[model samples]
Structure formats: C-alpha cells, structure tokens
Target: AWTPLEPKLITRLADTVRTKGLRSPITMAEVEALMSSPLLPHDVTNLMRVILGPAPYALWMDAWGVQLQTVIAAATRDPRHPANGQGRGERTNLNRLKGLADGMVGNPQGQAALLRPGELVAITASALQAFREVARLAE
Candidate 1:
C-alpha cells in the first residue's frame, strides 16, 4: 500500500491557493501517481478540506458545484463512457452522482450528506478523466 506522504500532496495543492492566488485549473504530477498509490476515496477529499478550511458543508458544494455540472455534461458526450446506463464513472450506481450534482444546484445547503466535509462515497477513474477533459483537473 502506497500513499504519498500527506505533506507532499497537501503542499502542492495548498501552494497554488496561498502565495499567488488560486493557480488552478491546477495540475499535479501526482495525478499520474494516483495509479501507484493505495488511497482511500477520502484521501483527496480531506486534502481539499484541509486546505479549503472549515466552513459549512454547503461551502464545499458551492466551490465545485458548477464544475461538477459541466463535467457531467461532458461525461455524457465522451466516447469512453457508456451511453446513459449503469456502468463506470459518473453514471455509476443509480443517481448517486447525479443526485449530488443536481441536489446541490437545487438546494446545496440541504445536501449535508453529499457535501459533508472530508467524506466522499465514491471516486472513479472515468470521472477523473471527465474532470480533466473539462479542464477542472487541468488538461
């Protein structure tokens, strides 16, 4: 099991926000290393939370809310993913990601379960690729 020491990943993520202004759409060399590491889904979520600071869970929803919207759109048109069925990526499970995507847009503050700090139910490679395509993950 391998995980990049917390400092390395957190510092790289935190650096863009601090000294400059938010230097994102952020890119990380570690993106490639996602394959190498044995990571829990929460690892990256917590990194974002640690840097993003304490606010209501709703705050997290607002930050990535629209980005999540666009990624879902692109994820649909992308060829690698299946056509609107139960498969890999954003379509995984039933309306899980979709519910969160729209639920936050519709009523983000009420979405405590979804936007809960440092907790994520799922993360998928196809979703990650979708984020990269939309430049949310930095092409």
Candidate 2:
C-alpha cells in the first residue's frame, strides 16, 4: 500500500526505460541484462504515482515519472502514421518504440521480453495514461 523504496531508487528504475532506450521492442537478452531488479515493485509504484498523482498521495509522484509516462505512451506504430518507407537500409536505425501503447495494449510480452523491459513499458504507459485521465485531474 506504501513504499519503502527510497525516492532515488524507484525514480532511477523508471528512468532507465528512456535512459537505456528500452521503450521499444527489446531483445530477450537485453531485457535480462537490464535487470538489476524488476518493475513490479517500486517501478509500478512510480507509474501509479504518475497516474494517481497528488492523490493516493499527491506527494508521491515526481517530475520524471510524468515525462516518462508521456513518452512511453507516445509511441505510434500504425498505418495512418507514416514512416520512412522507401529505400530503407536493412535494420534501419528507426525502430519505432512500442509499449502499452494505443495500438499494442493487447499484447505486452510480445513486444519486449517477459521481464523488466516489457513490464517497464507496460506499467509506465498505463500509469501515465491513468495519470492524465484521472490523476492529473486530482491535481
């Protein structure tokens, strides 16, 4: 119900999604390597903080959490949304980031591995969405 995790520890864990560029479809090995720990604990807490900001503990959420949530949910991979389609290099540098995004909410694990990376994107994305809808209003 409450967190024992230090502010720094939890925030840093959430931050790694961007800092390490893991917001998109990540490799199995990369997910494993990224884990000094997992997101089910404080990482989820941070996302929840963003979603339920200034309520459930208005004081709990912080700056990074909101921005992370925004970016995490912002990944768009759809037909209407265009990309570099012509004369692309093999394994081009543009791997559009995916998460619990508007399109791919149905399959979380299929994008990233079943550990921190996928859930990291999942929880953060959900948290951010919820924050904007409900939690942001709470503020």
Candidate 3:
C-alpha cells in the first residue's frame, strides 16, 4: 500500500505551472475565470503537457481517450488545418481535454464510487475489448 504524500505532487505540478509563467498558489476561482474567458490565450502546447502528465485516474483516462480521439480524427482528416497542428493552433484539442477533465473529475459528488474494485476493473477490460471490436469493424 503506497501512502501518497500530497505535497510532493502539488509541488511538482506547481513547479510545472510556474515554468509556464503562471503564478504559484493558483486558486479555483482564477482557474474558473480563465476557463470561462474566451479572450484568454489558450496555450495548447502547455495544455497537452499537463494532460499527459502525472494525473492518475482510470475514469479520467477514459474521458481523455474520447477527447483525444476526437482531435486525432480531426487531424487525420485535415493535416493542413490550423487547429490540427501543434502549439496555439491545437486549441480545440486543449479545450476538449479541459472540458472532459472538468466535467468528469472536477466534481467529487458526481464521481461514482468504487465499492467493487474488481468489477470496475472487469468493466474497463470489457470496454477495451469492445473498443478493439469497433476499431476493426466492417472489413
């Protein structure tokens, strides 16, 4: 059983954000304002880095898979599309990532319980099987 030292993760994440020029000790209100603001410069590169970083949760992974697949599909269809490329051009991907994460994991009360961990694992495994099936459909 690994005991999580919360401060370590918090410090690391804070350091990462600091390197991106954000102020330390960022508040939820500030984050909300930034998220809601249409005029804010959404740095897609930095956003991707954070999403692919040390976040640890299965439901989050599922949500990210959905959003990332959307961006990948878009990019595949139009490689020259500005939104398909990297940096600020990929803002749609970043926004989708944020939407998924915020909608699912941000509210603890909305989070479903894991009373039967084994069952949850089984369900996820079965879902992966379903994904593979759908992935090769109609050959």
Task: Give per-model CA RMSD.
Answer: 9.3, 13.2, 18.5
- The C-alpha TM-scores of every prediction are 0.37, 0.26, 0.25
Report how far off residue 98 is in candidate 3 (Å). Answer: 16
Error of 1 at 77 (Å): 7.1
The full ranking of all candidates by TM-score, starting with the best, is 1, 2, 3
What is each predicted model's overall lDDT from 0 to 1? 0.41, 0.37, 0.35
- lDDT for each residue of candidate 2 in 10-49, tens digit (9 for 90 to 100): 4554455335432233421333433334343244443445
Higher-lDDT candidate among 1 and 3? 1
Give candidate 1's error at residue 38 in angstroms: 11
**Which of candidates 2 and 3 reaches a greater lDDT?**
2
Off by over 4 Å in 2: 1-38, 46-116
> For residues 31-127, could you state the per-residue lDDT of candidate 1 as single tens digits?
4453234233344344445554444223544434454455457656663433234355434322334333445434433344443221232233433
Best by TM-score: 1
Put the candidates in lDDT order, highest first: 1, 2, 3
Can you list the residue pairs that collide in candidate 2? 51-131, 54-58, 55-58
Off by over 4 Å in 1: 1-5, 12-16, 23-41, 55-60, 69-91, 94-139
Report the error of model 1 at residue 53, Å: 3.0
